[PDB]
Amino acid sequence: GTGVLTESNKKFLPFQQFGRDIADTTDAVRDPQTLEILDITPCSFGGVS
Amino acid sequence: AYTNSFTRGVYYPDKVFRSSVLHSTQDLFLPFFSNVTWFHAIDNPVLPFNDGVYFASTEKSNIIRGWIFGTTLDSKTQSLLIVNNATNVVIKVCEFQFCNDPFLGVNCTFEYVSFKNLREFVFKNIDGYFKIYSKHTPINLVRDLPQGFSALEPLVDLPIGINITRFQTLLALHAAYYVGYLQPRTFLLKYNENGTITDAVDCALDPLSETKCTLKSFTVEKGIYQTSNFRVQPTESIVRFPNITNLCPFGEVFNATRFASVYAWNRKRISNCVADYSVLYNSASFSTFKCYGVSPTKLNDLCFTNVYADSFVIRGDEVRQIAPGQTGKIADYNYKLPDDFTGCVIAWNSNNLDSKVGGNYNYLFRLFRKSNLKPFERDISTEIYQAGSTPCNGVEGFNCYFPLQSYGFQPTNGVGYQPYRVVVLSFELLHAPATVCGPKKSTNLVKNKCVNFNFNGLTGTGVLTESNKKFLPFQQFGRDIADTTDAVRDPQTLEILDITPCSFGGVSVITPGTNTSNQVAVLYQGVNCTEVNVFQTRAGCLIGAEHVNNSYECDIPIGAGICASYQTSQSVIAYTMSLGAENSVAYSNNSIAIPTNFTISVTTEILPVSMTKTSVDCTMYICGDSTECSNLLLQYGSFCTQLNRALTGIAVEQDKNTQEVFAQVKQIYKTPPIKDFGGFNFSQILPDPSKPSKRSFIEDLLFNKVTKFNGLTVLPPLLTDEMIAQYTSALLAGTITSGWTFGAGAALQIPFAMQMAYRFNGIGVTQNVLYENQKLIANQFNSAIGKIQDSLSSTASALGKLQDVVNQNAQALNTLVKQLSSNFGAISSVLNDILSRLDKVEAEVQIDRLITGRLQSLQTYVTQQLIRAAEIRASANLAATKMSECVLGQSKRVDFCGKGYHLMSFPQSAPHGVVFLHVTYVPAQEKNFTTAPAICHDGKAHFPREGVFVSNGTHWFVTQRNFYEPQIITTDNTFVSGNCDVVIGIVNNTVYDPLQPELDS
Amino acid sequence: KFNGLTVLPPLLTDEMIAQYTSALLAGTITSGWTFGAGAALQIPFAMQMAYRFNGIGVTQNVLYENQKLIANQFNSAIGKIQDSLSSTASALGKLQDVVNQNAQALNTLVKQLSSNFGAISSVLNDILSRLDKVEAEVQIDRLITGRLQSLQTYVTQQLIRAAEIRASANLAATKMSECVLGQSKRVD
Amino acid sequence: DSTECSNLLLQYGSFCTQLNRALTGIAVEQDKNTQEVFAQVKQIYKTPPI
Amino acid sequence: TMSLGAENSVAYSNNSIAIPTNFTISVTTEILPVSMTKTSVDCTMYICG
């Protein structure tokens, strides 16, 4: 993927690997080595009008 | 013993955090309010497990310590055993037998290690993954499971492969426990702010739970909600064919030794006999059975009028030509299948039968002809063929040949030059009756009941019925306008049947809103009750409602004049709807009613105007930054540039819709420091300084009650919500301080009490009826504004049309977004997943299924958004016409500017729309009076200039049509015409003369 | 109408529609425009018509003076409606057109179940009863793609037609409000 | 009324449910059309004996 | 940042009115499209050429 990775506050339960927004899209993730809980803010974009 | 499961035993379906959201899935879920079997710390029987188990024990001191699982628990196959001690979990798989009915004391192919308290678990195996979910809580009721909801968290998830349909629990020996069973069910899950499940819905419990799941919601509003179609099942299945005498000649066709050439093929007939085609298609006698448009298993399901064994020898290389679409010397000049051939061909190596030492030449093929033969044709001439210009004169040479050849079949040729036998099954498979059929002999014939059927190979499902549809002696089917089957005739008995269609209609749930009740009723649209409390109506069968002999006004509309509501001991009644009360109007040739007092209503109307602008960047949405899809999407030409053009034309017309509605005012007018408006309290509808945006107070109630990244972009409006509010402020400030004059020119100020008197003349109620009631009318307007504030504060359901439009657009996008998860027949629905799986041609096919699907989905979205934009534009042209005619004007168009005779409207901005406060006059104190079309005087007929003649019962007056101001009838509120004799229904008053009291002075 | 094409009844039965057209008509007759703007205020029918003469700038005495004539002209015109309806196909063009269009759209939707869309047969059961597994499912996916594209075409055509019938129902709701419940000043 | 086709049709997502929503929206709108045309009246007024 | 047109304090009071002494007979032009080129793309000859 491509986007703005960040640390995040979202309260992942100890078995949870990923997190999602309302419309079923990846929105937060876990680091596999360190178990850091991360946002995925989207890659910034738009029209060149 | 047995007791309730309640709403409990619910667990996290997948390892994905979600929050503040009502997610849903099919899974094994515990059916709400199913039984649980109850047990005591005394006994551990072996129990069923079904698809999955909800288990719990209640202890102060932990007596349950483990479980044993499998289909049988027999230790003949490996059985799973598990032990839990709250600090740890232990897992074992075994066949080496312990105690035969076990407890825990106070070929073993796998092992692993990690009343006061209710210790809860859910156990399931799916796809070989055995999963434990768990929870713990204090409880107060000793005897039964609790009634407050909780959700269960995973302890174990292992691909052990041991599937389960029984279990036995393990007691600690030298308290109680319970068991309920999961079922494959759709369910709804209330994930809270902290990613925790806090409530659930069992979609398959009851009609209200089917409604809750249809709406993906825990609250449900009062209404009728469609759910699945009631497809009435066929009760039985029918087979009919003619019967027949012989058994098929397959030994004489296939075990007999003889065979022939392909230019001069042989034939034998399969007819007049029962068959089993597996005697051919499972036979060891053959090397191959080529079926085209057919699988050979079907030959015993089919039935045939005849089959012909069109049979010949060719060499093993040339068998390739015996297929549809092929050409070459056998298919060209000897024997041919049709290029649309549906049926089969038997082939085998016949070197064991047809070869001879020195090479056999007695089986032959044609080498040349002027043109190819037709399918199934034969041709036997032997004269020398010519293609060279120098003639052949009875001998071979350069481009001169004898027209037949043969292969020289030695018993030791290479396989391509060995003989092969071929039998083409030339079918006579028809709508005509069979003379050959498999094991499927006839059933009985079933009537006036919906059934599956087969007659001679015509098949379907329906209600077979006897009918007067008399076929001519050769006719065998009957059909209607659209070529649907309508009648048939039986093959054994020549009797006539009508195939009446089987039964279906949408099961629809009638409910009061969940906060008032959970009692419910169920419509079956048009279905007959004999196929389904139960009750019948013209719109179909109606379960669970109370049929009422009275008739209320409608509430939830059911269909064909039936409505339903929640009323008394309370019940969901259903009734023949009163279309209101049957008011027999107190009419006669002299009866009038003239109203003696009014009210002023302030009926709120709401209009959508500008749905949320979007652009969907057609490449980013369809392709997800793929280079591969960025290329493939070019194949479709200017497809994306026209979808992006369509959405841009929609988006520009939203700015246009908002400009056409709100920007009808050429200056931002603003209201004065002093609010000297003669009683009308606008401080609720005019701007509020006490906010970051200068909305009015009522606009701020409106803005409270009305409620992204996948290449979708929600582009801003051109006018900000504060600019839209500056326009509704300018509109409203003009509307208050200048009346209608600001639409037709420069705003001309006028005092609002005087504007309201203009608004009275525009309803034909003379404007003294305002001012001579001015404070009362101001209090009716102010009180109606109070009712509006109270309504909008209490009744979030009041702004139906805008919240509907916001929900339509949010549902349209939730469709377009969740369609990104749909496969459309691709390997995956995620495109960077496709491209991290796949490469080159292999990717490009699957990417093109997603391009086709996402393009069709984006086109469907764009097409419905174009039609919806045409609806919103009709509503915005309507709202721009209510802005021109009701705000910038006063409309004479009946019921255009709200019910009653409209006085004026105020725009209030609202999210993606507008609100009009239609102030209207409504008469409210009716009375009976005597009337006449005209009044006689000096033998002259008189008619009123404005209004109607009236009498209380003894004295004669005239009044405006809409308010009883009885005035003495005079030569200046009347006009003469002609004389009394012509005038059917005239009456004999005297009209007064306003010069007479001056003549008499 | 029988391949899952369920026709659903109107909420109001034809009898209830007749009770509403009767209420509208009995209101109109006995009370005029008043029943739209309140409760029905009764007024004699000759007088309810003298209101209607003022709403076209004809001074209302012209009605009461020509009352018997105007009644016979209305009755004779009602007889001509009966005779027009007792003869002429082009009397009710628009409704027999709408019934025929809905029936044509449905007959198209049903005969499209007889169209191949490039599949080996149009009868779904033929594929299911001669092809096994993935090859059958590919031919079925051609039939789904074609029937789904034809159902999308039907529903799209019915959305565009519902926008036309809604433009006509909004026109008839407007003619009910302005012509029956009122008297429209709007030319033609 | 068949199993294989019904499960292949799922792959297309909310086409079916938005087609049933479109036809339901058309169908409810035909009652709304009929209600907004004819039900412009609160009481079933009815005529005199004479 | 855009103008919405000139801001104006309307000269309001319970006794203030404005009346126009003169007019302009604005011959406004409104253009409404009514038809379009009557295409009939024969699907047969277009799709199969």
Ligand SMILES: *[C@@H]1O[C@H](CO)[C@@H](O)[C@H](O)[C@H]1NC(C)=O
């Ligand atoms: C449910 O409990 C009742 C006793 O209340 C019992 O008769 C019935 O057989 C039980 N059914 C199931 C499926 O557990």
Ligand SMILES: *[C@@H]1O[C@H](CO)[C@@H](O)[C@H](O)[C@H]1NC(C)=O
């Ligand atoms: C639970 O079992 C483990 C061994 O699997 C043991 O180490 C642990 O001490 C036990 N805990 C208790 C409370 O007995």
Ligand SMILES: *[C@@H]1O[C@H](CO)[C@@H](O)[C@H](O)[C@H]1NC(C)=O
């Ligand atoms: C142990 O299990 C295997 C199958 O995993 C089976 O073949 C074998 O017969 C079993 N051992 C005995 C002693 O039967």
Ligand SMILES: *[C@@H]1O[C@H](CO)[C@@H](O)[C@H](O)[C@H]1NC(C)=O
């Ligand atoms: C959510 O977690 C916070 C602490 O992070 C806690 O204060 C709050 O009470 C929790 N709310 C719920 C509903 O779980």
Ligand SMILES: *[C@@H]1O[C@H](CO)[C@@H](O)[C@H](O)[C@H]1NC(C)=O
């Ligand atoms: C065969 O069909 C005839 C009618 O065509 C019927 O009379 C006869 O009983 C049938 N025989 C059997 C065994 O079904």
Ligand SMILES: *[C@@H]1O[C@H](CO)[C@@H](O)[C@H](O)[C@H]1NC(C)=O
């Ligand atoms: C639901 O009922 C409670 C009282 O039982 C009430 O406080 C609440 O306002 C109601 N809400 C709705 C939407 O009916």
Ligand SMILES: *[C@@H]1O[C@H](CO)[C@@H](O)[C@H](O)[C@H]1NC(C)=O
């Ligand atoms: C339902 O079927 C019965 C016969 O089974 C019939 O008498 C009844 O008329 C049917 N219902 C309707 C609404 O016609």
Ligand SMILES: *[C@@H]1O[C@H](CO)[C@@H](O)[C@H](O)[C@H]1NC(C)=O
């Ligand atoms: C309706 O009421 C009458 C008596 O008032 C009774 O004869 C009739 O059977 C009732 N019908 C139903 C369906 O309740």
Ligand SMILES: *[C@@H]1O[C@H](CO)[C@@H](O)[C@H](O)[C@H]1NC(C)=O
């Ligand atoms: C009007 O008079 C008639 C006289 O028969 C009576 O039936 C009716 O109830 C009266 N209506 C009112 C509103 O007074």
Ligand SMILES: *[C@@H]1O[C@H](CO)[C@@H](O)[C@H](O)[C@H]1NC(C)=O
């Ligand atoms: C008015 O109607 C009554 C009967 O309802 C009748 O007696 C009377 O003659 C009628 N008026 C005229 C002018 O004929």
